[PDB]
Amino acid sequence: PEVKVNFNPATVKGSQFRQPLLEFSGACAGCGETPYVKLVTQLFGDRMIIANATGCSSIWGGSAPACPYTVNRQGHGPAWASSLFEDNAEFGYGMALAVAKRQDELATAISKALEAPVSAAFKAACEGWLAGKDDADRSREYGDRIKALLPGEISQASGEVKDLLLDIDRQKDYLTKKSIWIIGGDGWAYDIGYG
Amino acid sequence: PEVKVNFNPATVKGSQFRQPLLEFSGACAGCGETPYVKLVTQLFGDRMIIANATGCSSIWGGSAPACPYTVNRQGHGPAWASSLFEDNAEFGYGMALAVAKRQDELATAISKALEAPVSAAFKAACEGWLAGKDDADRSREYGDRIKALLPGEISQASGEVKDLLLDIDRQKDYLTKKSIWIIGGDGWAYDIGYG
Numbered sequence: 001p002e003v004k005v006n007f008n009p010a011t012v013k014g015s016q017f018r019q020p021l022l023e024f025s026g027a028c029a030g031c032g033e034t035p036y037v038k039l040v041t042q043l044f045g046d047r048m049i050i051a052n053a054t055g056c057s058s059i060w061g062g063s064a065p066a067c068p069y070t071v072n073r074q075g076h077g078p079a080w081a082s083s084l085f086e087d088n089a090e091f092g093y094g095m096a097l098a099v100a101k102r103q104d105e106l107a108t109a110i111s112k113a114l115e116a117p118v119s120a121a122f123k124a125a126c127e128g129w130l131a132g133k134d135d136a137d138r139s140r141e142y143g144d145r146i147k148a149l150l151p152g153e154i155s156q157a158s159g160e161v162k163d164l165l166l167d168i169d170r171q172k173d174y175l176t177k178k179s180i181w182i183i184g185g186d187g188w189a190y191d192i193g194y195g
Numbered sequence: 196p197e198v199k200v201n202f203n204p205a206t207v208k209g210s211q212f213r214q215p216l217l218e219f220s221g222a223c224a225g226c227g228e229t230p231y232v233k234l235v236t237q238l239f240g241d242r243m244i245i246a247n248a249t250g251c252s253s254i255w256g257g258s259a260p261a262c263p264y265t266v267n268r269q270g271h272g273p274a275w276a277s278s279l280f281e282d283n284a285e286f287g288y289g290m291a292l293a294v295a296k297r298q299d300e301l302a303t304a305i306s307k308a309l310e311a312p313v314s315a316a317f318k319a320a321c322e323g324w325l326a327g328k329d330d331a332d333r334s335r336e337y338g339d340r341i342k343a344l345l346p347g348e349i350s351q352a353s354g355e356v357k358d359l360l361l362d363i364d365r366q367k368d369y370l371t372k373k374s375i376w377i378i379g380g381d382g383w384a385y386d387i388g389y390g
């Protein structure tokens with residue numbers, strides 16, 4: 001079973017107690033690429049999206065039908081996508097625009113929830129999230145309180161107030177701030193995708 | 196008529212006594228672009244090839260049926276070409292490869308001319324050109340001596356020796372070293388063509 005430990009994730013020993021979310025890929029024995037991505041998944045894999053350029057990182061990272069990126073016990077893990085060899089930077093840039101747009105729709109539904117007859121504990125977590133929606137730790141902190149209070153709050157609501165809470169529940173996957181990562185080889189970064 | 200003067204071309208006064216090879220373009224009144232290219236034509240227009248990106252410099256520089264680039268009294272002037280907006284640097288890079296290839300074919304025909312029964316004055320200019328074929332001034336100096344001696348040399352030759360001199364006459368336009376210039380706007384250089 002999982003064991004909650006307070007080892008500092010900023011150290012080598014503390015980081016390896018986190019579950020790896022990149023495992024058993026098709027890279028060569030002793031590859032110099034996969035250890036880097038594996039460490040990133042152990043630190044921020046809970047909330048990251050990957051835009052991967054075509055290359056080795058896309059061949060051992062995304063050759064059908066096997067996917068080396070996995071999830072933790074909570075079912076959360078990095079979402080992985082590879083478009084083309086030359087557009088990987090702009091591909092990931094587009095994701096950052098969209099993810100910000102999805103969080104903006106949620107913040108609007110949360111601000112409207114403040115004006116609705118909902119529980120005082122629910123209003124407390126919403127105000128805390130709006131102030132730290134762009135902070136990785138704070139958005140996870142107040143977001144989880146919102147996720148925990150939503151099912152009981154929806155049961156106690158009705159009419160258009162219930163629809164407002166149901167719209168927040170539909171977008172609760174954008175409470176936690178995401179981390180966009182654009183991964184590629186030197187051939188992509190130094191040549192075809194440098195522009 | 197043309198007046199040979201020994202004013203230093205490196206000064207402003209000396210450069211303007213050279214004939215401009217960019218005249219009467221379609222640029223705006225007081226454009227900040229055309230004065231730059233005009234000065235380049237007055238210095239090296241005798242032996243330059245232009246790879247121009249799409250933009251203002253291609254619209255006032257190459258809108259049919261009027262061409263603003265002209266020639267001097269000797270009939271020599273810049274050759275101008277525009278491929279696309281995004282490839283102008285590689286377009287001009289390809290020209291530099293080809294021009295070097297054309298000079299290489301000429302140097303082979305000149306080295307073979309040293310082994311042929313030709314005039315002593317012709318052999319003197321060929322040895323001088325081979326040593327300075329990559330120097331702008333020296334290649335023009337010894338090249339013009341070769342161009343001046345060729346018609347009399349061809350008249351005095353026969354057989355395969357005459358064919359060797361006729362092959363040099365076919366390539367005499369690559370004695371003088373060329374100057375490849377890649378002209379474009381900031382939109383080309385900073386964005387789409389920066390890679």
Ligand SMILES: Cc1ncc(C[n+]2csc(CCOP(=O)(O)OP(=O)(O)O)c2C)c(N)n1
Pocket residue numbers: 054055056057084085086184185186187188189
């Ligand atoms: C537009 C385009 N050009 C070329 C290719 C072929 N291609 C696939 S991967 C690759 C190079 C990978 O080198 P690098 O970016 O350094 O990644 P690495 O494999 O070294 O990790 C190339 C040229 C392609 N798929 N698409």
Ligand SMILES: Cc1ncc(C[n+]2csc(CCOP(=O)(O)OP(=O)(O)O)c2C)c(N)n1
Pocket residue numbers: 249250251252279280281379380381382383384
């Ligand atoms: C592939 C492509 N994209 C866009 C264009 C349209 N286009 C023509 S000129 C130009 C911009 C010119 O700006 P700049 O490079 O700064 O030159 P300037 O006109 O300022 O001298 C653009 C976007 C094109 N012709 N081709």
Ligand code: SF4
Pocket residue numbers: 026027028030031032033056060
């Ligand atoms: S980068 Fe590619 S080829 Fe090189 S060791 Fe890793 S998997 Fe093998």
Ligand code: SF4
Pocket residue numbers: 221222223225226227228251255
């Ligand atoms: S750059 Fe183009 S638009 Fe600007 S002054 Fe020159 S010709 Fe006119």
